[PDB]
Write a structure and sequence with these properties.
The structure is cut from a larger assembly and holds chains A (about 200 residues), B (about 210 residues) and C (about 160 residues).
Chain A (H helix, E strand, L loop, with lengths): L20 E14 L2 E14 L3 E9 L2 H14 L1 E3 L11 E5 L2 E7 L10 H9 L5 E6 L5 H12 L4 H7 L10 H22 L1
Antiparallel strand pairs in A: 1-2, 2-3, 3-4, 5-6, 6-7
Helix pairs in contact in A: 2-3
Chain B lengths: L19 E2 L6 H14 L2 H6 L1 E7 L6 E6 L13 H11 L5 E6 L7 H12 L5 H11 L10 E4 L12 E4 L12 E9 L4 E9 L7
Parallel strand pairs in B: 1-2, 3-4
Antiparallel strand pairs in B: 2-3, 5-6, 5-8, 7-8
Helix pairs in contact in B: 4-5
Chain C lengths: L20 H10 L5 H19 L3 H12 L3 E3 L12 E3 L2 H17 L7 H13 L3 H15 L9
Antiparallel strand pairs in C: 1-2
Helix pairs in contact in C: 1-2, 1-4, 2-3, 2-5, 3-4, 3-5, 4-5
The chains are: A alpha+beta (about 200), B alpha/beta (about 210), C mainly alpha (about 160).
The structure holds two RNA strands.
Chain lengths: ~200, ~210, ~160
RNA sequence: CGGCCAACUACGUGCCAGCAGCCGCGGUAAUACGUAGGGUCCGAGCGUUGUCCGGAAUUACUGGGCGUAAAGAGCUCGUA
RNA sequence: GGGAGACUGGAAUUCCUGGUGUAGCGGUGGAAUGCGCAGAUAUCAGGAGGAACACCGGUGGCGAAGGCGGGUCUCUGGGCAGUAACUGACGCUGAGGAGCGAAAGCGUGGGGAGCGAACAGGAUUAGAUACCCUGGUAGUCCACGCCGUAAACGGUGGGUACUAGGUGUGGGUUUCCUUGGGAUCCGUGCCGUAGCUAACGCAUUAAGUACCCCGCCUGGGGAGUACGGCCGCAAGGCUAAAACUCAAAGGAAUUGACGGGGGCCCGCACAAGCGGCGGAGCAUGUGGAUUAAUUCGAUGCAACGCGAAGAACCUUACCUGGGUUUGACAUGCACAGGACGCCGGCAGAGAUGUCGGUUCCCUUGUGGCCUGUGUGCAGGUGGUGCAUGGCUGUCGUCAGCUCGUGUCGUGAGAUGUUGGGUUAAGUCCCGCAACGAGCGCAACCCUUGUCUCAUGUUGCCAGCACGUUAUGGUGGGGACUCGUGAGAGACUGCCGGGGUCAACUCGGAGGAAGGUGGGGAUGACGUCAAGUCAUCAUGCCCCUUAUGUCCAGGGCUUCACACAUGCUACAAUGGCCGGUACAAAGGGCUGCGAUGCCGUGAGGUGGAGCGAAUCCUUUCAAAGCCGGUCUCAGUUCGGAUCGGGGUCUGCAACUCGACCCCGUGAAGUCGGAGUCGCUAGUAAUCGCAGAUCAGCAACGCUGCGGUGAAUACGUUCCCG
């Protein structure tokens, strides 16, 4: 990924809507032996997302690096994924496993900061979280820890969803501090939203 | 390795015309010598200008030197000042008198020689080589009416020690078909690390037009 | 043209003077290269010398010598497992005529008469009686075939 | 002032002299050796060596494993 | 076929005695040691003795695991189902511990047929202390004990509860049809969801979901080793470290390459032929050694009649010597100029120096022109093809190589492109989680094969006329060629059969030609750090008083050798003399050069005529045919070598040219191991022209035509 700063007198750079947040996690040239030598190709693990908390995971195969990055962008574009939150935190401590990828995603009080390793830091920095506390146990990789983090975010659910599963009136599903954090986060949603209307 | 014959020399009987045209018995070696020194004399300032083709028709010892380029305005500066200087030096180096016709190509980016010009002159200018090619194309892919393209670049690419050849294309470029109308142009970039020889194949169409 | 199957062969015209397939085929196997006309002069002159020493039709003498040198079995050289086996095989008609004419010409060429005409005359005559070295090569080829009869089973 | 790991160019030696925490750099065009400019990080300090905890879920109570990766006693009966 | 003890059965192998009976048997990839000829192997009868149990018998039964199959009898262990009669949690696991525990091995005593470590001989091999062969002791067997190990493996500790199924088979109970089906409890296999796993896989017989107890692991070596202890008759087992060292050692799967793996295919790959090379002489090229110098490159296939399509001087890069400095060649600066430069004379090997004649063209400031003196600088066939570009070879004219988008997979990746058939071919059809594309293959192009239309000189000459000497030679003619333009024509198009009624294949017709008619040109993605800084261009490094440059002479041609490609041969299908018939293509200006004359002949003198369908290369050939002679021989074969005598080219044929004449007259009697080319106008043989070139090392290279074969049964074997 070099020589991107450019000014063209051509038709268009085609800049348009959906200015999302896009992170390229790792690139390892992938070789293939054929008759008389090696054929080098490229893999780019592409994370895309918006600051609401919708995450994509794309996996680009091409024999050029920006081609593989662009194919990962289109593949994560094809496949988004909804993550439920509280304010800008996570709901409750989970462990995700993608066959060797263990990631523990635990919430924290706000202000602490996204503390995670670089793959999980990528998937969570694209997402709508600002203050959680994760760790990547096992598998020491990028692909399995990204995919394990997304499986970990599939083990998430709303407080309300849990209440619904059990047919119980909330209050009765959460404890009270987390309901107060719901009041804080929806209150600042009201303040920034009504400042957004004017 | 790739033992690929120059396709403008592989279809020079069938589709592509000769560049130089006369008849000569016992005057032929002299006409060859004048043809060579004329093309060396039209190498430098016209390769600044954007030269593509240098045809020399030759009637009863006058001469007619015709050049196809991409900017009438650098070849013809002030009228007669830039034209009649190289014209007059062609009149003095040859022992003859020169009728220099200068003409523009309707699209520079679909001449394979001019594509090789712009690509190699970008590649001497420290740009990214995969970006250059890839932009060598996109443009030409187009634009007129141009059914192939194939760009190869060997040499010290990016200043590296290994001489890596690259091979990008789009569409149909059949070399073994003789009704191909393929334009071919190889021009050689001059970096400080060395020379990056650029080959460009451009397949315009199936049309024989016999 | 092997490994694709049998290949079609050229049809062979008969002799002008004698009128036989076998005379012309003897000419084309007499042909030390270049001079087919001189091969015709050798074969024709040798068969009129056979006409002198027989007083009969020369092609009957030729076909009787050709019959008396013609083999029925030929030995091969097929090798099953670390031992070379002389394998006897039935000989086709064209293969047998080829071995008859080729042995006739070559062992006429070894014989010590002055010209080639007297060599080929004396070899067609001695092969007609049965006294040439070529008949001894037929008996040595059947000696190798009958001596090696057991290996012939492979059905090969 | 290769990579991790903020920070790059020329000159000089070209498997030498040397470097290095690991991966590894030196075979006359080294951003990895030595000198220079320049940059970065610290600052009355800044590097090295040693010793310990950490990262190490790498002795796993919290928090690991045992078909083939290290790992199921050859198989039973039975005392605590 | 759970175990132990006891008794017994037959087939087979070996030996033994006795018949019958003869020279081989045995053994192997092929053989030989070996047993025989004293009576073997073979066959028949009888006898001994030992061990193992054909068939039933297998993905089957039983046992805790080892393990267990001839039969019968005796003693004994466990399992399963059914009823629920009894006891009433008595269950589970189990550190240490005791017991059982294949084979090999160990002790004492028996037994010893077959097999058989060790051990011989034989063979194979470079060598076998090996496989293969012949013999052969401990052992294998039984009694009584030791030992305690195995890939003792389901590589899966024991118990328990639950979690879709489908189909086999083993043991037993019952409801229904009335053996069939169902349901059930216990067992053992194959396939399969969910779930699990790193992946392969597992999957109600879990590697799934959970609980209980035990064993065990903590990077690879060092090492299951030392030290110590315990057990053991011993071999050894058990328990079990550290220094030190490495930056890994591993698991599963992927793409390739590879295989003395499998299948299916092809190619002068072998076979069938024909002709060669390797031995002789020479011609060329290379190695090596020489040398003042033997310039430089190219060393498996794919270097070695290759860069060279022309080394006396030149070329030329090398050597001894003589010169030389802005240089042999450019261009930008300064600075003077006025001619530069020329045509000579002289001295010199020549470069060069010194004398003699000519002295500029515009303008008024210079330019065209050079020399100086400097200045940048030119110049390098100096180095690096492991810094490159360009051009090229090769795998191979082999059939392949990829991509886009979809799906499959955590991923590398796969799929497509695999399957069925077909093809010269990833050619093409039919299927199939793929659907399409692209570069290749084919086609487009040239040449060759037939005809139609056009077509008339320099080309043809039939029908006409005229020639006479010499012929289309000449008036003439478009008829035949032929020359070069346009066009038709081969498409499985037409008929028969196989084809899945698809592709395609076997035959037939028409046709000049039949199935890509023949041959070209055409080299995919890449490989090999292949070739080339000496064609050229070029990055960097080096020389700049020489590694530049000018000349004479020398060398690149040396030669005790070794290789490699060619040519002439070794004779009678031949040699030599005489007569005679048929080509194709080409070449030509300070070139090709005729008749005539002089030579023996290279050639000399001369110039007809042609920038050439015209003239010249003679109307063109040679091998061919007719005739004569030679008589199998170191020759009337063979021409190397050497002597004399010439001609031509060039300033110059000494080192180093070709050709002719006279003489001279060697090796060589078809060529060891090995090896090469070729499938039809091919091989073989016969001349002809061309490029390079003043001349030629041309027997080379590129082409042209003449005469013209044999064989291919077929994929076992070698090669790709």
């Amino acid at each position: 990924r070099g020589r991107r700063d450019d000014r063209g007198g051509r038709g268009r750079d085609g800049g348009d809507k959906s200015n999302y947040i896009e992170r390229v996690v790792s690139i390892n040239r992938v070789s293939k032996v054929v008759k008389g030598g090696r054929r080098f190709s490229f893999t780019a693990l592409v994370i895309v997302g918006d600051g609401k908390g919708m995450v994509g995971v794309g996996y680009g195969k091409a024999k050029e690096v920006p081609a593989a990055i662009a194919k990962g962008v289109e593949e994560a574009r094809k496949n988004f994924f909804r993550v439920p939150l509280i304010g800008s935190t996570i709901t409750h401590p989970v462990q995700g496993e993608a066959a060797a990828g263990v990631v523990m995603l635990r919430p924290a009080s706000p202000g602490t900061g996204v503390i995670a390793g670089g793959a999980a830091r990528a998937v969570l920095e694209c997402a709508g979280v600002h203050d959680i506390l994760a760790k990547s146990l096992g598998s020491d990789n990028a692909i399995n820890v990204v995919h394990a983090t997304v499986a970990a975010l599939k083990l998430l659910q709303r407080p309300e969803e849990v209440a619904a599963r059990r047919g119980l009136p909330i209050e009765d599903v959460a404890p009270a501090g987390m309901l107060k954090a719901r009041r804080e986060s929806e209150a600042l949603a009201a303040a920034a939203a009504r400042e957004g209307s004017a | 390795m790739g033992q690929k014959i120059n396709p403008h020399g592989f279809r020079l009987g069938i589709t592509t015309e000769w560049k130089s045209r006369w008849y000569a018995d016992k005057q032929y070696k002299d006409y060859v010598k004048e043809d060579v020194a004329i093309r060396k004399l039209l190498a430098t300032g016209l390769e600044r200008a954007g030269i593509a083709d240098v045809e020399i028709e030759r009637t009863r010892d006058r001469v007619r030197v015709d050049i196809h380029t991409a900017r009438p305005g650098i070849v013809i500066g002030r009228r007669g000042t830039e034209a009649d200087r190289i014209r007059a030096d062609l009149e003095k180096l040859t022992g003859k008198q020169v009728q220099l016709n200068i003409l523009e190509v309707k699209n520079p980016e679909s001449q394979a020689q001019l594509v090789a010009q712009g690509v190699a002159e970008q590649l001497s200018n420290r740009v990214a080589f995969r970006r250059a090619m890839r932009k060598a194309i996109q443009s030409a892919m187009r634009q007129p009416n141009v059914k192939g393209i194939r760009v190869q670049c060997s040499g010290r690419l990016g200043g590296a020690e290994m001489s890596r050849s690259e091979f990008y294309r789009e569409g149909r470029v059949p070399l073994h078909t003789l009704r191909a109308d393929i334009d071919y142009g190889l021009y050689e970039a001059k970096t400080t690390f060395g020379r990056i020889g650029v080959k460009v194949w451009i397949y315009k169409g199936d049309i024989v037009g016999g | 043209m092997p490994r694709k199957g049998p290949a079609p062969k050229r049809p062979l015209v008969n002799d002008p003077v004698y009128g036989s397939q076998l005379v012309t085929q003897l000419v084309n196997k007499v042909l030390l290269e270049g001079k087919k006309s001189l091969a015709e002069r050798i074969v024709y002159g040798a068969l009129e010398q056979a006409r002198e020493k027989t007083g009969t039709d020369p092609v009957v003498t030729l076909k009787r010598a050709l019959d008396n040198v013609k083999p029925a079995l030929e030995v091969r050289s097929r090798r099953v497992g670390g031992a070379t086996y002389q394998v006897p095989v039935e000989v086709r008609p064209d293969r047998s005529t080829t071995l008859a004419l080729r042995w006739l010409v070559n062992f006429s060429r070894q014989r010590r008469e002055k010209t080639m005409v007297e060599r080929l005359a004396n070899e067609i005559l001695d092969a007609s009686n049965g006294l040439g070295a070529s008949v001894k090569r037929r008996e040595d080829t059947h000696k190798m075939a009958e001596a090696n009869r057991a290996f012939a089973h492979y059905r090969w």
